[PDB]
Design a protein around this ligand. Sequence first.
Ligand SMILES: *[C@H]1CC(=O)C/C(C)=C\C=C\C(=O)O[C@H]([C@H](O)NC(=O)/C=C\C=C\C)C/C(C)=C/[C@@H]2CC(=C)C[C@H](C1)O2
Ligand SMILES: Nc1nc2c(ncn2[C@@H]2O[C@H](COP(=O)(O)OP(=O)(O)OP(=O)(O)O)[C@@H](O)[C@H]2O)c(=O)[nH]1
Ligand SMILES: Nc1nc2c(ncn2[C@@H]2O[C@H](COP(=O)(O)OP(=O)(O)O)[C@@H](O)[C@H]2O)c(=O)[nH]1
Ligand SMILES: N[C@@H](Cc1ccc(O)cc1)C(=O)O
Ligand SMILES: [Ca+2]
Ligand SMILES: [Mg+2]
Ligand SMILES: [Mg+2]
Lengths: 440, 69, 431
Amino acid sequence: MRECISIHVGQAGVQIGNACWELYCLEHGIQPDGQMPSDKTIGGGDDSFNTFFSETGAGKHVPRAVFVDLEPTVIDEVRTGTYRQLFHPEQLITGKEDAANNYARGHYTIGKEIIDLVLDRIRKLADQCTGLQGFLVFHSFGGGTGSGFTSLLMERLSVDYGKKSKLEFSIYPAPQVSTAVVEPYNSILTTHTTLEHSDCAFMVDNEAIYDICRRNLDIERPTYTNLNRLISQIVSSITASLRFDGALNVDLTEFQTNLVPYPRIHFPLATYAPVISAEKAYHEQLSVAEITNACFEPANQMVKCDPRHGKYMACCLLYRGDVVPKDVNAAIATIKTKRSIQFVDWCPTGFKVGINYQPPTVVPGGDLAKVQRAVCMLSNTTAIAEAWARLDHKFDLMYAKRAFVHWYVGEGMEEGEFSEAREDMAALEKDYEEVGVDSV
Amino acid sequence: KREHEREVIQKAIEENNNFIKMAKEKLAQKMESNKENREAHLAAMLERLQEKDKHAEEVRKNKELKEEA
Amino acid sequence: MREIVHIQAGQCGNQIGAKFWEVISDEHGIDPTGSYHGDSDLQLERINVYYNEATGNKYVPRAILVDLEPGTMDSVRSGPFGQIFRPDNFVFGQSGAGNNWAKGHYTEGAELVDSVLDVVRKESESCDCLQGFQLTHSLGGGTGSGMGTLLISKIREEYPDRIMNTFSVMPSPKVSDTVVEPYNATLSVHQLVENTDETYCIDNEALYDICFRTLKLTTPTYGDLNHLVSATMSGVTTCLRFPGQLNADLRKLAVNMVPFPRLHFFMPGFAPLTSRGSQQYRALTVPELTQQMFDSKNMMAACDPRHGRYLTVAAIFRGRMSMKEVDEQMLNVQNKNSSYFVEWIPNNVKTAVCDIPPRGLKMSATFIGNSTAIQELFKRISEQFTAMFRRKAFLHWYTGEGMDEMEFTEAESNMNDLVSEYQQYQDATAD
Ligand SMILES: *[C@H]1CC(=O)C/C(C)=C\C=C\C(=O)O[C@H]([C@H](O)NC(=O)/C=C\C=C\C)C/C(C)=C/[C@@H]2CC(=C)C[C@H](C1)O2
Ligand SMILES: Nc1nc2c(ncn2[C@@H]2O[C@H](COP(=O)(O)OP(=O)(O)OP(=O)(O)O)[C@@H](O)[C@H]2O)c(=O)[nH]1
Ligand SMILES: Nc1nc2c(ncn2[C@@H]2O[C@H](COP(=O)(O)OP(=O)(O)O)[C@@H](O)[C@H]2O)c(=O)[nH]1
Ligand SMILES: N[C@@H](Cc1ccc(O)cc1)C(=O)O
Ligand SMILES: [Ca+2]
Ligand SMILES: [Mg+2]
Ligand SMILES: [Mg+2]
């Protein structure tokens, strides 16, 4: 039942959305025209996949999703592409002029012209739900729309849906693929503004994904297409418990109980395995032990940081495919007797396990080998704060000279907003230090 | 105990409503301040440009008075 | 944002403007009749940024041609691609500006500017989402310099939220028409500092030196200089005209390149620039492009970047090449030149690759630098200005139009302030 509405904001949010929804269709046997032969209840139902897809009387399975961007060219590709029939046109929303890598334009100058229309479209999706659970919001930190429009939208969703859950998948900037010098300003501004409005946020460091593609898939120079296919496998792992049933399946909301010890401490670290090429996977079966071991290898993390140099407040293992508890328990025991896994003194140390039996899927033409079993670890580690420290320092370097600040002030913002946001980030860093200190 | 049960749920309701009200008010204040700020920035720019037109008139006037010689 | 409106004013402005349109029309597969005859869909994907589409599948440059005398524009009309321009978009007077900024800005130019604005408005009103404007002009004459900067002010008044971009040709005694060029340039820079968002400093000094020293042209003509200018203008606009991720519009370019609003004067550069003789010995490769584009000899402003520091840099490669190699070479060049990028703007060098190379090259690179060393250009002009102004040479040409000395003093001071500001940021440190 419990429906989830996905909102894909700006270029990164939209292109990652493309990859996710394509992958979901393949996992569920939904064709590009939205038909699903295996679904025998026409025009509706309460199957697990219905959390993410509504149905029309003509048998179309329609994503519960809105795609929004302030310029039209990325969403235009969706409108004209392979899955164009999947979406009702009103779910794909564009303006004419983008935010120009400026949070201020995304939140105020341009964003304000389209925010009411976007809310109207989201309301139309919500009115079709019988038990809406919440929202999943996909966006970059660095873009003007991804940063500024997302913030505005999150603020408005708090007002219109109260404390209905809002989760983010947030794309953290990397120099190898970034397109604006001001991305650190945009990141801090949006992180500050969204913090009280988000229940849980999964950061995806483009640099971490870039190096996984280069190192584990032998891709010379990863493109967004390469990055997004990997990201979608990870998002799929996280949402699989919402979209599939199963005796050993554990709901994402139940993992969230363990992952969020205080409202602001809501940024889990995801680590995914196995990421391997067809050439390397051939004749090589990677066992539960092997993929579990890989979750404690920092090179497989979706955010660059070193958990061996922090403390854990939760560890969750989300398995999919050919996996049974006996083998998981054995792998965990081995890891316990060999790894730098130290918990804070106020949290239990047991790992929380879920298993979804539906095996992983890959998109044709992709880089990942098709495997029989995979795992996503979600941990709450103080180490994730290193990501904020890196961004915060870049912010400080430029802000000390007020470099580029006139672009924001010109669009109506005040320096006071910059210092407020940065102070909130300094407080968040301190929060992460404090939770790690032993109890008196 | 029943009185306490009633108090807990009305507390929960009150805090959720207050969270909404605060979010709504903060956003309204921010959008108004931003609008006023951007408009004032535009007005300042146009004011400067209009001064230039004033100056240009002055120059052409000055030429004409020196050609009355 | 999508459409750009192009304006070209004065002799220099119309001459480099015409070449710009010839060069990019070829790149986009548009012939002199405005018909398309290309092979790649990349050529048309963003064609509307620069061209209107008319009846009969014709593409018409969104271009307005302005002058206070008919001669150059007559030659444009008769030149190649001359018939491609919209005839109603030719706006010209008969009296000329006599190489006098004051006549261009306050007198003759003022009499003509409304008819020019009428055409701008007509082009702009038909735009789906106007980005802004690009103007080509010299700063050393009267029309381009004076009327061009007048047009900038008037356009800004009607389109205050759109981006104003210029390609501004700086005067040099090596390629000199008149003795008052330093006056006209200083008065013009005064306007540009206040009223444009981004300006490409196209320096006749640099163009002459590249022609004479590098290409071994004993007597460079304006044609030789303009070939370099159009190669550069092609290069710095490729991100606007072809599909891509970086600096894809005028505002995103400004947000990446301009950290302080007055410091918006860019040093453009082009590679390769090697004589045919030396090409026998030196291969055209990505590392060669990278080293050249960061060398003083390849800059189109006569400034040495190793005498200052970069605030921000855009590097655009064109042609078929390894993305991995470009990335490695750009990392290498930043490493070897670390001191010359300000430490307090992290990740301030952005890189793009466009698959379509310039005519007649397998590959090329275009450099756009916001370097504090551009102060060398402004100091050169200032030194020439002051030499004349301290003896009040030729002032009567300007006061005769109704200006007073004070306006000269103010332009001088504003340009000297600009230099001090570059120096301040050059000297700044993170600690
Ligand atoms: C203008 C062509 C023109 O009319 C003169 C002719 C036909 C060719 C000019 C070529 C040119 O100037 O070549 C340049 C360099 O000397 N070439 C190299 O250095 C090549 C190899 C180096 C290896 C180490 C570069 C130049 C400015 C080319 C431009 C490109 C463009 C936009 C069109 C313009 C056409 O040529
Ligand atoms: N992983 C991934 N990152 C992306 C993708 N597209 C853009 N990015 C990253 O997102 C940031 C740029 O923000 P965008 O999402 O492109 O910008 P936008 O939200 O459309 O905002 P404006 O264009 O400024 O209106 C940079 O850090 C890019 O590297 C994508 O498809 N996948
Ligand atoms: N690079 C280049 N410079 C030019 C050209 N024509 C004129 N100039 C320069 O422009 C300045 C003279 O201004 P000009 O455009 O002739 O005056 P206007 O007609 O009043 O705008 C001098 O510095 C010349 O060197 C040209 O075709 N190419
Ligand atoms: N020492 C504090 C740590 C803390 C961190 C973040 C918070 O938001 C709150 C508290 C505690 O455990 O109570
Ligand atoms: Ca059904
Ligand atoms: Mg965008
Ligand atoms: Mg001339």
